Chain length 264, copies 6
């Protein structure tokens, strides 16, 4: 259950071990998540251990508070260096598990991300606080009023943000991440309204982890698009995920959702 931090495989026998152990071959319960030039991994056994403990608990708020570190351990960054070579141009398999059904965020919503997008000050963070959410995971944003009085959980890195969201959604709760600010800032690639196009692939990768898990996670993203190129940028963002809600001046201006039987 311990993650290798420094020591990676140097022999072929060691290279065959799990990512957790410092090898190069995912175990059956490890899914790699490419994000820019990083490769993370979710351990779906740890994930469902935590999610089941939450969902089955007589006091899930208390279990959460007492096991935050275990929850955060669901997603980690493997130590082995050769992953980019061994798995070229890695993505995540687009899947929908058998018997998937959804009423939230909308009826028959495809599993994946539901993005809440808009410019600086558009009201995305406030929009969340008015949806019927279980928990807002606060990451990479300056401390605001949202952090003093709401149902929030503050985290420090992308492992923690994804771990809490995955565990909460797998348990049957409704999580949102506010926000992917540090992905927008951190990811760099060939541009297409000045947007690093690797942002789109990162959102698709995380989206498809959600799809394989049969969950929807709501996520705030300010892509930093100029006024002219915002329509194109939002279209490419919507084409990368299951659903999108656009905020302009505190009001919803557009919403599009891929559904099990269509696209709305």
């Amino acid at each position: 259950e311990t993650v290798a931090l420094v020591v990676e495989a140097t022999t072929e026998a060691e290279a065959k071990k799990s990512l957790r152990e410092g090898g190069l071959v995912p175990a059956a319960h490890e899914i790699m998540i490419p994000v820019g030039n990083m490769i993370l991994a979710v351990d779906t056994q740890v994930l469902d251990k935590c999610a089941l403990a939450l969902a089955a608990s007589d006091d899930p708020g208390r279990w959460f508070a007492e096991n935050e570190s275990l929850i955060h351990s669901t997603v980690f960054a493997p130590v082995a260096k050769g992953l980019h070579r061994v798995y070229p141009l890695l993505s995540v398999r687009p899947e929908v598990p058998a018997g998937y059904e959804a009423s939230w965020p909308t009826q028959d919503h495809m599993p994946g991300l539901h993005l809440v997008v808009g410019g600086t000050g558009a009201g995305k963070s406030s929009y969340l606080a008015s949806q019927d959410l279980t928990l807002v995971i606060r990451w990479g944003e300056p401390a605001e009023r949202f952090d003093v009085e709401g149902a929030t959980h503050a985290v420090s890195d992308l492992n923690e943000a994804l771990a809490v969201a995955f565990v909460m959604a797998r348990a049957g709760y409704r999580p949102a991440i506010d926000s992917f600010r540090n992905l927008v800032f951190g990811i760099e690639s060939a541009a297409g309204g000045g947007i690093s196009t690797a942002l789109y692939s990162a959102m698709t990768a995380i989206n498809n982890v959600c799809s394989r898990l049969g969950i929807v996670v709501m996520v705030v993203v300010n892509p930093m698009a100029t006024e002219a190129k915002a329509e194109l940028v939002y279209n490419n963002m919507a084409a990368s995920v299951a659903g999108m809600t656009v905020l302009m001046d505190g009001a919803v201006s557009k919403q599009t959702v891929r559904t099990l039987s269509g696209r709305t």
Copy 2:
């Protein structure tokens, strides 16, 4: 098995196959340069798998049950010196003796047939008109296509190529939806290394006597689309451009000449 971490450090080891961590391709290894990556296909493992798949009752099930053989069919060699030893590597353009084609068009050169166009141009739904055996889904978000239809989802470029190669050598008709991560991941008004990557993969298909259909959204601007589309067309056997759900342009290199098409 493929060597994952131990590479040649002596001249004797360097003479061994790419699979074994050496620098010299064995009789049945073909190197595939893709951007700054170098992959390899083992044509003996390939035709092994193609024979096994040909006697299968479910192509889709065979692939899901044989991920070990697929990763043996196309892999990324561990030896670091390949870029230096094989300067400006491509794949040699060949046509096997006795090659015949009626799909996608009559006398179509073996190679890639690109299905290209902008976001939401209808490329994914266009594949439904092409009498394909199945669509290999890669790098795209989970969509209606992935739950209703003959698809096989993969995670990386080795897997996408291996499945398509095995399918085509067995006599089936594959498409890859899509090469999105080549567009985003290759960086060098599009990076010229996208064009050489398509020529390299195209010529592997030419050596194998196969045609693989491939979706590409190049993320070009309206001003530069016409240029980027010619550059793409000059890299491959054939190309079909979609706009707003309809074919607007087509060009195919054939065994004795060239065809063109113009629509709306």
Copy 3:
């Protein structure tokens, strides 16, 4: 003492504190990502120093006599793998229980209060109106401010942060003049990594329940000033813009809302 050159090379060493050359923060270590750098504050050493400073007759003299303790309070960990282990690291946004503020404004969120504007806008002299305990001078040329007035000059970002943190935890009011070297030294129409660096430092202040005033000349063009100033304001608790010696704009995030100001 802080490890300067020997870092963890075994899994057992990796579990040790950042101070000791490991990769896992001890109970009282908080990582501070700044561009491609990762610093750490030790909150136990911090409150040690804050108690010692609180019983001092000269804050300025105490700092000059305790450079060893200051370099123990904020330091740059030696272990190289931190960027990989903690992906897209930020600082978690928190507000300590019982936090109260009347300075710089009523109910001001803990965080940074930026004093911003172009060259010669009057930022350094503006600090004289803010009832500060002293101005921490960093990255600026020797000026009249440095010979006449309550200043303490430092050389690097660890020192600037440590002095400000110790001062504020002890109940004094610090300003840093200036973050010039963050503007110049962070590079990635301003580098987006300046914004994430300010959010990270801001949220360390939020966790500590303090406000630190900080001068920033972002070197933006007249055309882009309005945009860069919103991006800066969206990264921190509060911001005051100077033009030609006068406040032209202000915005502050408070415990229950937001304030704005407009001048000439």
Copy 4:
């Protein structure tokens, strides 16, 4: 006759050995060829061994087919890392061997490259198939009709392309390379119509190998120049080599050749 692939000189005694052996000092029969950031080497003893065997053979087509690997071994990429330092800003000596004469491509043509240049689709590949050539070496281009029925030889990398061209021309035959596409794509430097100026130096380096060898090699180059800047780009290309033919819409539009007694 074996080329060092992994093991390079680590002592001064080893550094004095030939490039073939992993040393840093060319033997009398090794000529280094700088191409972008690469350094190749032609072994002129292997070259003239192959060329003489071809030229003296009762069945040169059969000798070629039976010795393709030996032919390809004429040019290799040395393993030693310090070559760029030891030979700063390396080029190739401009020489014309005593008693040089030429009737092909034109009368009294300077030894060197004869470039066939023009934009995408301009008819360069077809132009070759109408010159009185012995062999077209196909490299880096997608498989086309040219590869099914003509006198062609398909290769994979720049070593092979140069080896076959040098050997064929030294034997008294007339070779062309279609094309230097992967040099245009692969080489990057300070631009001057957007053309990486290291393209010009690569063509001069290869040109001067041809001049030292007393041969002319015809080479297709599509420099990817915009319409506006094509006149300047073609002029700089002509200034880098012995001769140039420009194709526009399948017709020759300009031709310029440096001659032993003038410039036409």
Copy 5:
């Protein structure tokens, strides 16, 4: 007194030694000087040894000529690699020593640099030869008439230029450096009239060494600003140092000096 050139600290005990010895911790008489991505160090004991020997000498010109190498050893580049990490965003402390007084270049001039700025051919070098200077240190400029007949001392690198200037000024003489040409060329960072903004921080760092030493050094700087953006660039240069004189067509057009009691 010997400087470590190759061997740096590899243990914590060694890391605690002086920069001269290959450690990471400045001795009490070492001041680090960040310049772009370099870190130099001035040894103030060697500095004042040389300066006192000069100032006390019955024949200071002869002592200078006989001890040039010792003078040049006052500033060196430490060998230890971790300095950028250990001292994040390093600058130099802005200080003015107690009892500082100045009549040169102007009355009550702040200690620091006095920049002589202007475009190519503006007359900066000639301007120096008309000020009442003791010595012009010539660095990085092509040999000109200034080097044949004047009171000059030619040096090769930034250590030597700073060493001679510091020693001369500490001895009570009046030095100028003509010029910082290689800093302008060598330093690269995010731009703000195309000027690498790390140029401003380098000038502030060197300025503050002068301020800590209670000296003024005159320095020629041609920032290579375009005509349009020169006013802004000169303003940012003046904001980085104690004083500035601008030359246009061989005449002084602007002069600004920070004084102990004001700014002129």
Copy 6:
């Protein structure tokens, strides 16, 4: 002999000469920084060769028979730390006592005399009017100049400099045609490192009391030519601009002043 691969790893080895793999120039070694490269001339070997050449019946034959001595005269030191130890290295501007000049012009400063202009401006043929001893051909395609005329062809920058230095110290008049590969190979509207490279080589000539004529095609645009030509002229002793075969501008720094010329 020059060390090619073994460099200093102890402080004792570091004190040895550059030739021997150390970091400290011997009495007669002068470092020559060129872009990111650092070369060295050994002035004792130089004057050895100049005496031998002076008693030669064919300068051209002497050079071809003494490639070993030429590579001992200018070489690239193996030690890696030189950039750090000698920050922003240049060459000190000097004029030897007793220097006199009548070529290329009266009282011409020792240094480079650049012959500059665009493609086909007539720079190579202009050298025929300058009463040269021979033209050192480097980096240019084989031309009529190379078969008819007094030329000596070389391959790299060490060779070009060494031949020119030896020729000039022996009393002959060398020109280098051309520095093309400095223009293409130095990259940092021209890279400013071209200008500092010319100043460094210029000042080596100044220390040696020689003038070397050098052709440069800087590849500037018509809009930027005037600026790039001043920047080049401000880097060297003298410069002549060619347009369409005729001198259009000239400037020369002399022992006591400056000359200028204007043509068509």
